[PDB]
């Protein structure tokens, strides 16, 4: 993806005006520095490889972390899958109106020992389960529930101390692209919710300890990482200026255009 | 000369005498839906002389203390002729547009407008916990207008209309990434934009989804000296291009 | 049992690797593709589109549309200065938040030329001539029009064509520069001066405005992707 190189230039005295244009046409001028001054011939070997949409987006970013405790009934986690709870991946995905990618999904699970009162605790390695429930399936209501059989719902099991688990997910959508913005309602009467929450139906993700609580409580935390592969992107969008406020909508409190200096001629 | 155009669509004609070029979309022209792209099975309606014609909206007044205006695009033409009657009887529909904003003043006036057409422009609410109601987001062929100040949070369901954030939380100078054009009163008189159909689905319901927004924002304010004409209007005419509809039922 | 031997780097999670992993939904049939207008393949197609730059940050203009208008009047002296700012596209607060300077804050290095377009939003009966200069570093900022004509300048005559382009060139000792503020890779200054006056007739307002745009040329390039310092978070968005 090599960039264009500059050609040599000579003094001119003519009726050709490359420097004079009209910006009211909505057209960006294609002038080069060899049209306004005398240049030499350089040949550039610089590439535009690190600014592709694949290289910009295909990096792992944390999207959530949730906790759950061993020594508790209904100590298990749940998360309704979205990408609008962190600030850094939300701003990168919202430079485009529509996107279409596959996923790669990594989990980082850790644990901590909680203040028990029994003498000489000694635990084995912990095993965790992460079950994915598509919209419409049965949900678990406690740790020893029937819904963790996983007859058709996909799940992973993982023992502590190994490499982190990792799956791959195709483009799972009803439309032809994912939408980051949606200017509309759910109802035909134009009441109720408004915005991108109408198009978000991706499922829930559950987490538990498979082991039973032996002698001390254990509090675990799982972090979820997203990595887009095979990316396509349409209709670029200006980058967000104000800080994000909520998850479901695009509300803001107004901020200045940039920071200020003391003069128009100060450097 | 490169300063004159003539656009003819149906039984309507637009002539202009000083103008910039015409901007077409993201490079593509509107066209009907193909067969390897479609998903609905019944046959579409293509009336195409009764709906693809220029409809003129109401006029707004450019004052000196004026901040901007906006229109939500398949909603302004929801009571316009046989285009708004086909939207009521059908469930689906897809449509490209051609927009002609026109504003004339003398050689003794000055000012500059940005005419931008932005897709999927979700607006923000004044109260940070709600979403804005429908009557604040759009009117039928009447302009909703920006403000030079900030709407208070005590208002429950309104649109945040601080003009330097453009209602969407961005920089208003960065809105030149969408298909846009300027009206400089020194050089220009009118701006013409041709937009294709942009969505993530091949057809959509035109009553619960506004997929285009037309904003007109004065960057350089209007000015004149005493004796010149104070009343300067702005007029917008929009014509659908290559419109088709599926799913005929009762009138809604 | 083929004999193998595991090397360092086993069972680690490096967040910028490139491997294959088993699918969780086997034989899934995806939605067919669609021709959507406006496909972007490279981020250097966004930076080549020009956006308006707020030269007028004067602490009561940043929360208004007055930040973008450069005031231009009819004087009684000659050789005055219109504006001036250093050419730091990712550290100076004038060019920091534009469409080019927002892409640059995701990267560490940059190189190439930079376009600066100026539009004269005055009356059609007003005239004027300006001097748009760029001076490489080593000396200070030019304090006169005489010091600014020794650099790379253009002389702009307003008329039917209302816009002019000042193209700053790539004059550097290194191949790349830093986006962050570095004195070792300083890039110089951009100033503007009155060549002649703004002469208006009677019953015409003598105070005009100028809009400024900034884009990138076809030899622009970026390197070493990082995280932007603009967005921030304390708790989860809920």
């Amino acid at each position: 993806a090599r960039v264009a190189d500059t050609i040599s230039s000579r003094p001119t005295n003519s009726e050709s005006i490359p420097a004079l244009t009209a910006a009211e046409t909505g057209h960006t001028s294609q002038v080069v520095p060899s049209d306004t001054m005398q240049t030499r011939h350089v040949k550039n070997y610089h590439s535009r490889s690190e600014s592709s949409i694949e290289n910009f987006l295909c990096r792992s970013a944390c999207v959530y972390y949730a906790t759950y405790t061993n020594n508790s009934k209904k100590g298990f986690a749940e998360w309704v899958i979205n990408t609008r709870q962190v600030a850094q991946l939300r701003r990168k995905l919202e430079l485009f109106t529509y996107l279409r990618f596959d996923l790669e999904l990594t989990f980082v699970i850790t644990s901590a020992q909680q203040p028990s009162t029994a003498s000489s605790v000694d635990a084995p390695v912990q095993t965790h389960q992460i079950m994915y429930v598509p919209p419409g399936g049965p949900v678990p209501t406690k740790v020893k529930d029937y819904a963790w059989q996983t007859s058709t719902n996909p799940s992973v099991f993982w023992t502590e101390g190994n490499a982190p688990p990792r799956m791959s997910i195709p483009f799972i959508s009803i439309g032809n692209a994912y939408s980051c913005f949606y200017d509309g309602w759910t109802q035909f009467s134009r009441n109720g919710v408004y915005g991108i929450n109408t198009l978000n139906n991706m499922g829930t993700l559950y987490m538990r300890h498979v082991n039973e609580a032996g002698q001390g409580p254990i509090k675990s935390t799982v972090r979820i990482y997203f990595k887009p592969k095979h990316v396509k992107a349409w209709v670029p969008r200006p980058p967000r200026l104000c800080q994000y406020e909520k998850q479901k909508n695009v509300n803001f409190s107004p901020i200045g255009v940039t920071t200020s200096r003391t003069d128009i001629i100060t450097t | 000369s490169d300063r004159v155009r003539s656009i003819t669509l149906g039984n309507s004609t637009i002539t202009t005498q000083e103008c910039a070029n015409v901007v077409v979309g993201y490079g593509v022209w509107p066209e009907y839906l193909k067969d390897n792209e479609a998903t609905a099975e019944d046959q579409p309606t293509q009336p195409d002389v009764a709906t693809c014609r220029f409809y003129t909206l109401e006029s707004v007044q450019w004052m000196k203390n004026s901040a901007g205006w906006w229109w939500k695009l398949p909603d302004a033409l929801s009571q316009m002729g046989l285009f708004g009657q086909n939207m009521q009887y059908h469930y689906l529909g897809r449509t490209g547009y051609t927009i002609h904003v026109q504003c004339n003043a003398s050689k003794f006036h000055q000012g500059c407008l940005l005419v931008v057409c932005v897709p999927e422009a979700e607006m923000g609410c004044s109260n940070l916990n709600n979403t804005p109601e429908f009557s604040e987001l759009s009117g039928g062929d009447s302009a909703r207008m920006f403000t030079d100040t900030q709407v208070g949070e005590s208002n429950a369901k309104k649109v945040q209309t601080a003009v330097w954030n453009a209602g969407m939380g961005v920089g208003v100078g960065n809105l030149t990434i969408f298909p846009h054009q300027w009206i400089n009163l020194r050089t220009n008189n009118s701006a013409t934009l041709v937009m294709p159909y942009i969505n993530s689905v091949p057809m959509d319901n035109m009553f619960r989804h506004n997929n285009l927004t037309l904003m007109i924002i004065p960057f350089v304010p209007l000015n004149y000296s005493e004796g010149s004409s104070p009343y300067v209007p702005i007029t917008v005419t929009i014509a659908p291009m290559c419109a088709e509809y599926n799913g005929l039922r009762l009138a809604s | 049992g083929l004999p193998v031997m595991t090397t360092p780097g086993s069972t680690q999670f490096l967040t910028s690797d490139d491997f294959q992993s088993p699918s969780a939904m086997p034989q899934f049939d995806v939605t067919p593709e669609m021709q959507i207008p406006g496909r972007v393949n490279n981020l250097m197609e966004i930076a080549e589109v020009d956006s308006v730059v707020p030269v007028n940050n004067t602490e009561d203009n940043v929360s208004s549309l007055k930040a973008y208008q450069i005031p231009v009047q009819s004087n009684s002296d000659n050789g005055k200065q219109v504006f001036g700012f250093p050419l730091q596209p990712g550290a100076n607060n004038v060019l920091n938040r534009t469409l080019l300077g927002e892409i640059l804050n995701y990267y560490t290095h940059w190189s190439g030329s930079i376009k600066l377009t100026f539009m004269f939003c005055g009356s059609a009966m007003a005239t004027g001539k300006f001097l748009l200069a760029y001076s490489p570093p080593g000396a200070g900022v030019p304090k006169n029009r005489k010091d600014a004509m020794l650099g790379t300048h253009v002389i702009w005559d307003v008329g039917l064509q209302s816009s002019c382009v000042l193209c700053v060139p790539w004059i550097s000792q290194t191949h790349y520069r830093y986006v962050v503020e570095d004195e070792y890779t300083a890039a110089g200054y951009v100033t503007c001066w009155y060549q002649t006056n703004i002469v208006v007739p009677a019953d015409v307002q003598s105070s005009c405005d100028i809009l400024c745009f900034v884009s990138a040329c076809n030899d622009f390039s970026v390197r070493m992707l990082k995280d932007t310092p603009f967005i921030r978070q304390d708790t989860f968005y809920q």
Partner: antibody
Amino acid sequence: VQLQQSAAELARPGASVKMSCKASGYTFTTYTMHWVKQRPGQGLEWIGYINPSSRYTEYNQKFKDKTTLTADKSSSTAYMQLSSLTFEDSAVYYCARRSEADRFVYWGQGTLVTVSA
Amino acid sequence: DIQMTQSSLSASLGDRVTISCRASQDISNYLNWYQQKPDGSVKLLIYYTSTLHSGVPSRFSGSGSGTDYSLTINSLEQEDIATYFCQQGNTFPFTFGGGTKLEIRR
């Protein structure tokens, strides 16, 4: 990041007083700054805020005519002026910085304002 | 204005303490819990119905739905002897609850 308020004050009934909240460790014009009042026999009570980027203030409907909030972008300071001081205005006043939606993560230490003669 | 009704609870060290407050209408899981130390410093504990802020120990726990909410400390220590307010973020303006001060039993 911390917010540092001024020292305790004292005033006559009918006079005016001015507090302070010097913020450091972050960019001052990015977040709004809110003011909370706590009387010693009551709970906490919200007064108003100010947008430091545009100097836009919005008050509660009870403190609308007595309180005046102001700020400066130079010294990273936010002021609050109480006017027509009565004996109900003897409390502890906190400055807090609002975050994601309705959460105040960073608080000041409070100033004791007491009226007497 | 949403009335946020919460006065002084007593418990021994190392026991389970439960502080509750009740809204006037539905606030839709938008509740926050704060802690005011006896020297006068305030800090955020739980920034949703159940989500702990970073730097808060795992003794604290939040629950509730609709109108009735609660805050639980599972093992009382000497550092948790403070005043606890609850705050809603559903309607303009922000309303806080009254305090609830913890003290030693005997």
